[PDB]
Amino acid sequence: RKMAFPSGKVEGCMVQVTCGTTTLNGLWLDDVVYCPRHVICTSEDMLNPNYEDLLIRKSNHNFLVQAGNVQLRVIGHSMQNCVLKLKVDTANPKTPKYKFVRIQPGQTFSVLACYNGSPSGVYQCAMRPNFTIKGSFLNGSCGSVGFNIDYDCVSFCYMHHMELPTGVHAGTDLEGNFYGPFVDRQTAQAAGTDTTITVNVLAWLYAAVINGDRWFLNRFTTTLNDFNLVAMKYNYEPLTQDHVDILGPLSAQTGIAVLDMCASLKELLQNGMNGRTILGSALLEDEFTPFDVVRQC
Amino acid sequence: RKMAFPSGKVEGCMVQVTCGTTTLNGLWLDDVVYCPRHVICTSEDMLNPNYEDLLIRKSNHNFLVQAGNVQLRVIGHSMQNCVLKLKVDTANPKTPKYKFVRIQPGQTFSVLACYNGSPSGVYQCAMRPNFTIKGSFLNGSCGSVGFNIDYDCVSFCYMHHMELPTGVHAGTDLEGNFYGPFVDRQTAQAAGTDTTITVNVLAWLYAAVINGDRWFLNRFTTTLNDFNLVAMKYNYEPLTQDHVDILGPLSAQTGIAVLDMCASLKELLQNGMNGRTILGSALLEDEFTPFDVVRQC
Numbered sequence: 368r369k370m371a372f373p374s375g376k377v378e379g380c381m382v383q384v385t386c387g388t389t390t391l392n393g394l395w396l397d398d399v400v401y402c403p404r405h406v407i408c409t410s411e412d413m414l415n416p417n418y419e420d421l422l423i424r425k426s427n428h429n430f431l432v433q434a435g436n437v438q439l440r441v442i443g444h445s446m447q448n449c450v451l452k453l454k455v456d457t458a459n460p461k462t463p464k465y466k467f468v469r470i471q472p473g474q475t476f477s478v479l480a481c482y483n484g485s486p487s488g489v490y491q492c493a494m495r496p497n498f499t500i501k502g503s504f505l506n507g508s509c510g511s512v513g514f515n516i517d518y519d520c521v522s523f524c525y526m527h528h529m530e531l532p533t534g535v536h537a538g539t540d541l542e543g544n545f546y547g548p549f550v551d552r553q554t555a556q557a558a559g560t561d562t563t564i565t566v567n568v569l570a571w572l573y574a575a576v577i578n579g580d581r582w583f584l585n586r587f588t589t590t591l592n593d594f595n596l597v598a599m600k601y602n603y604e605p606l607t608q609d610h611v612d613i614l615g616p617l618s619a620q621t622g623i624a625v626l627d628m629c630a631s632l633k634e635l636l637q638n639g640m641n642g643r644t645i646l647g648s649a650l651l652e653d654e655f656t657p658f659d660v661v662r663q664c
Numbered sequence: 665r666k667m668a669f670p671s672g673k674v675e676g677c678m679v680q681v682t683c684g685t686t687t688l689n690g691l692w693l694d695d696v697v698y699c700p701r702h703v704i705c706t707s708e709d710m711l712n713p714n715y716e717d718l719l720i721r722k723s724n725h726n727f728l729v730q731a732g733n734v735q736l737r738v739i740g741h742s743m744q745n746c747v748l749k750l751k752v753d754t755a756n757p758k759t760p761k762y763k764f765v766r767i768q769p770g771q772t773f774s775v776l777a778c779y780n781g782s783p784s785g786v787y788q789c790a791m792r793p794n795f796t797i798k799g800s801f802l803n804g805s806c807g808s809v810g811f812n813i814d815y816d817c818v819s820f821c822y823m824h825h826m827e828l829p830t831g832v833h834a835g836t837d838l839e840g841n842f843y844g845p846f847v848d849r850q851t852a853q854a855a856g857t858d859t860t861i862t863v864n865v866l867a868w869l870y871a872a873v874i875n876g877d878r879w880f881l882n883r884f885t886t887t888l889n890d891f892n893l894v895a896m897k898y899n900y901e902p903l904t905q906d907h908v909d910i911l912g913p914l915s916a917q918t919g920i921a922v923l924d925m926c927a928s929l930k931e932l933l934q935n936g937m938n939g940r941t942i943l944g945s946a947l948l949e950d951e952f953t954p955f956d957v958v959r960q961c
């Protein structure tokens with residue numbers, strides 16, 4: 368079962384930010400509200416916004432920040448890459464211990480999808496190798512954030528900005544830098560060709576075994592390089608030695624050498640599933656990291 | 665995707681309840697804490713407990729209830745079916761608006777997996793027609809709850825008690841009444857063979873049509889009885905009147921009557937997919953209710 372972090376610590380930071388007729392979500396940490404800068408845009412701006420030029424023309428009072436049944440007065444604004452930082456005259460008492468991090472492709476995080484500053488749902492995602500993410504984001508979800516929770520500390524890693532024509536999504540870290548070659552203008556943008564996160568597919572196979580499902584296994588083996596040759600043929604990420612090291616615990620917990628599971632996965636890529644399923648799924652799932660699998664088993 | 669409700673309102677209600685060394689989770693709403701009654705069981709008592717005799721031997725001061733490290737003094741106790749209701753001397757200030765609801769098989773709900781009273785994860789579950797759930801629960805998870813949020817109000821519908829031989833899970837509503845034919849004894853128990861959740865498969869087909877995928881729509885229709893008798897032959901559930909009703913909005917949204925979609929589904933069962941996909945899948949998904957379909961559209 369694909370599992371997200373309890374979202375309560377993030378829910379208490381979500382506020383509604385409005386500029387003109389655009390409304391989206393902001394993240395209220397301490398006395399700063401973070402949100403996507405394209406909130407300041409209009410139609411005649413969306414296509415080629417000179418954001419520095421549009422921002423200087425804005426006043427503290429053009430920003431209506433509403434937290435619940437209360438407006439927060441903006442007493443300053445600044446821009447950092449594609450995120451807009453609005454200073455407010457109040458501090459969020461519910462601010463949790465947090466940090467801002469930029470995650471790598473193949474890493475996973477939970478997403479608190481929000482509309483008009485109100486949480487609506489949470490789910491688990493991975494940073495695809497092509498720096499998109501496959502989310503469930505509708506109009507008004509912008510400003511929703513992705514995060515991980517280690518101990519009592521919230522590592523924010525993503526803020527939502529756009530949906531690509533293919534239906535995947537693009538966004539920035541909380542420093543405002545996009546993941547991938549995307550731009551916050553209203554233009555149709557294609558991504559690089561995506562690939563499957565092999566070390567996550569292997570972690571997930573190990574999980575199906577831990578849960579008493581071993582039909583995909585086989586008595587064969589493979590070298591790492593020979594496996595990566597096949598893996599890349601099928602547009603699967605290469606497996607590094609660190610990837611093998613990271614899989615050690617699952618290899619141990621199950622007595623299935625990593626390279627043996629690579630042989631299994633190799634057979635699956637060349638043969639298919641031929642009706643059969645793993646952990647309910649007819650597709651090879653690649654949004655469970657080894658760490659995700661371990662914590663849950 | 666499976667998308668959970670935001671969990672913060674339920675996180676604010678989780679505590680831990682300890683008898684001797686037996687610790688599970690409980691649910692703190694106003695001045696009452698709800699938990700599974702087998703907290704009063706020693707490991708050996710669980711093989712075939714006498715709950716009434718085990719309860720008579722108990723007093724308020726045998727019950728350690730902690731929010732975090734903070735003790736809530738128990739001032740009274742009673743047993744309602746398979747759950748324990750502990751009166752505590754502090755009303756929970758984080759109490760949401762809430763109700764206790766008993767869901768039907770097929771309905772979905774989010775589960776907040778907790779251990780020692782601390783949330784670890786939130787995920788979406790479906791109550792199978794055999795009254796199990798395919799959850800992700802470990803030792804110490806008992807007392808974790810399942811809920812839906814309707815506007816401001818948290819509807820609590822599940823409390824976790826046990827894992828069955830087959831690896832699925834079982835539990836009660838918040839009045840302590842088990843879902844399905846199970847009991848809180850550490851004895852061998854078996855869930856009836858599972859079936860496919862027809863209403864949810866139908867919701868899924870509606871979802872495929874809303875997205876333009878509609879090849880499978882046919883020109884025929886059927887009666888509810890005819891469809892029910894046929895669907896059982898493929899180990900699909902029969903439709904109830906309530907199932908027809910909650911498909912109403914999707915029927916209205918698409919203009920496709922429920923019994924027309926039943927005929928289209930009947931055709932898929934009898935003739936198969938012919939290798940075709942629906943929403944990018946040859947398998948028919950049955951863990952998305954008509955509500956979830958809307959929430960994501």
Ligand SMILES: *[C@@H](O)[C@H](C[C@@H]1CCNC1=O)NC(=O)[C@H](CC(C)C)NC(=O)OCc1ccc(F)cc1
Pocket residue numbers: 391405408413504505506507508509510528529530531532536550551552553554555556
């Ligand atoms: C939040 O404001 C919103 C979220 C989008 C809307 C629907 N689903 C989402 O994930 N973001 C946008 O509307 C975004 C803003 C621009 C200025 C960065 N544009 C967008 O999502 O559509 C991109 C697009 C542009 C042109 C085109 F032809 C096709 C798609």
Ligand SMILES: *[C@@H](O)[C@H](C[C@@H]1CCNC1=O)NC(=O)[C@H](CC(C)C)NC(=O)OCc1ccc(F)cc1
Pocket residue numbers: 688702705710801802803804805806807825826827828833847848849850
């Ligand atoms: C909560 O106390 C616990 C949850 C179980 C433990 C493993 N996974 C779960 O979901 N419940 C019980 O231990 C329960 C108590 C009796 C009174 C009903 N017994 C139980 O679930 O037995 C089956 C079991 C299977 C595997 C396992 F590792 C432990 C127990």
